[PDB]
Amino acid sequence: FPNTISIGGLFMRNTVQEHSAFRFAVQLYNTNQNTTEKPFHLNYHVDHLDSSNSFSVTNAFCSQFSRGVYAIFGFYDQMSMNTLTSFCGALHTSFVTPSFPTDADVQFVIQMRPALKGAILSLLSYYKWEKFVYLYDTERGFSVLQAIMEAAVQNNWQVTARSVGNIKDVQEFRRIIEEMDRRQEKRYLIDCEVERINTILEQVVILGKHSRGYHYMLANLGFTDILLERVMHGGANITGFQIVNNENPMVQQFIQRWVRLDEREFPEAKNAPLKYTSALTHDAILVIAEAFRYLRRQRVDVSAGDCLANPAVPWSQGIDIERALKMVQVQGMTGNIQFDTYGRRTNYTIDVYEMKVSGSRKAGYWNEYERFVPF
């Protein structure tokens, strides 16, 4: 086993807090004084992507690959998903990511962002949403959209689906909302980005659609990031989902030790709310450390060239590392962390917040086996 484990980091734009969480988690692992908890020193090579120039993304990935790396933690969007996923799958290099899970079942990628599809379907069945308006964009994949369509077909729902990803003018949102209200539509499932959700909520506030007779289900982890101050005052239902628990002791101690770091080495940390992606980054560091500790425990022999070496020969140990990254069962800031054969999270819990009352109240939780437990 190597005396030092080096990993890579691929950070796209607007990931300052995620970068700070990555550095802080690596430092937390490194400063542990227990030889059993720290059998190897962990280093990282951090590079920043463009995500619009595939040449730049490939250059950064190949610079990471040329130097010795055992795993790559990073982020991708819809424009850089395919390049990184394909390169990692072909070169047998594990890619640990907090980004949206891939629609296709692909290997050598560990996406520890739980899928909202099951929770969304369970809440739709529980609330009995047999007719609603589904406003979606395709910036996080098509899994939720396909699941909604299949559920509507099998359950004979009345789902009015609208793709709002390509809308640049707010009057289009106003027209959509007015048309929906003309048809007496009271229930909206908004599977969009945080900024698009904010724009839609501004439009519904402007049109006065935030009254007590409307329900908005925001299908987006990061409930604390959406601006809901002005929609609460109208009395409308707002269902949200989260994976970070504030009263979790591990989350509590991380926050306690995390809000007292100077904003010169860890920017966007102290005077800023903790995004769920930072918790996923901390959990990713935990998963990597646990997997490599297990590899050392079993005495598995793990120890580059260039990306494009046609005929490409993958390095043999990589598969083992993938297995080590997929058999872990760890407890992190998002709760239980386990992965299936495709790298997707399994046996996870998603907290559901109703927050219709003044403030935020956690209406219940969702689990794969016991579907939805309300309070």
Q: Which residues bind a copy of itself (CB under 8 A)?
A: 52-56, 58-59, 62-63, 79, 82-83, 86-87, 89-90, 128-131, 138, 142, 145-146, 149, 153, 158, 163, 166, 168-169, 182-184, 186-187, 306-308, 310, 312
- Interaction between residue 237 and ligand NAG (CB under 6 A): yes
Nearest alpha-carbon partner for 173 in 139, 140, 137: 137
Among the residue ranges 33-41, 87-95, 170-178, 273-281, the one whose residues contact ligand NAG (CB under 6 A): 33-41
Contacts of 195 (CB under 8 A, 6+ apart): none
d(CA 37, CA 234): 51
371 near ligand NAG (CB under 6 A): no
Q: Which of 23, 140, 186, 293 binds ligand NAG (CB under 6 A)?
A: 186
Smallest distance from a copy of itself to CB 281, Å: 25
CB of 214 to ligand NAG, least distance (A): 6
Tokens in use for 205?
């506030």
Measured from the CB atom, is 282 or 345 closer to ligand NAG? 345
Opening angle at CA 136, ends 134 and 139, nearest 5:
160
Site for ligand NAG in 68-127 (CB under 6 A): 127
The amino acid present at 151, given as its one-letter code, is A
326 lies in the site for ligand NAG, by CB under 6 A: no
Q: How far is the CB of 160 from a copy of itself (least distance, A)?
A: 10
Least Cβ distance, residue 345 to a copy of itself (angstroms)? 25
Of 317, 243, 326, 320, the C-alpha closest to 282 is 243
Nearest distance from C-beta of residue 264 to a copy of itself, angstroms: 30
Give CB contacts under 8 A, 24+ apart, made by 305-311. 305/66, 306/62, 306/65, 306/66, 307/58, 307/61, 307/62, 307/65, 307/87, 307/91, 308/62
Q: Is residue 215 a contact residue for ligand NAG (CB under 6 A)?
A: yes
- Give the nearer residue to ligand NAG in terms of CB position, either 134 or 214: 214
Contact pick of 2, 13, 30, 37 for ligand NAG (by CB under 6 A): 37
Q: Which residues is 188 bridged to in the sheet?
A: 133, 216
**HSE of 120 in the Cβ direction (CA atoms, 13 Å)?**
25
Q: Which stretch binds ligand NAG (CB under 6 A): 8-16, 32-40, 137-145, 244-252?
A: 32-40
Contact status, residue 71 vs residue 325, Cβ threshold 8 Å? yes
Considering the complex, state which of residue 16 and residue 149 has its C-beta at the smaller distance from a copy of itself.
Answer: 149
235 sits near ligand NAG (criterion: CB under 6 A): no
For ligand NAG, the binding residue among 39, 336, 364, 371 (CB under 6 A) is 336
Instruction: Give the shortest CB-273-to-ligand NAG separation in angstroms.
Output: 26
Shorter beta-carbon distance to a copy of itself: residue 106 or 272 = 106
Long-range contacts of residues 349-353, Cβ cutoff 8 Å, at least 24 apart: 349/243, 350/114, 350/116, 350/119, 350/241, 350/242, 350/243, 351/241, 351/242, 351/243, 351/245, 352/119, 352/123, 352/239, 352/240, 352/241, 353/223, 353/239, 353/240, 353/241, 353/242
| Binding-site partner at residue 232 among ligand NAG, a copy of itself, none, CB < 5 to 8 Å by type | none
Rule CB under 6 A: choose which of 213, 305, 314, 374 binds ligand NAG: 213
Alpha carbons 246 and 45: distance in angstroms, whole number = 31
With respect to a copy of itself, which residue has the nearer C-beta, 2 or 305? 305
* Total residues at interface with ligand NAG (CB under 6 A): 13
Choices 78-86, 176-184, 213-221, 246-254; region in contact with ligand NAG by CB under 6 A: 213-221
Q: Name the residues that contact ligand NAG, by CB under 6 A.
A: 34, 36-37, 127, 186-187, 213-215, 237, 336, 347, 356
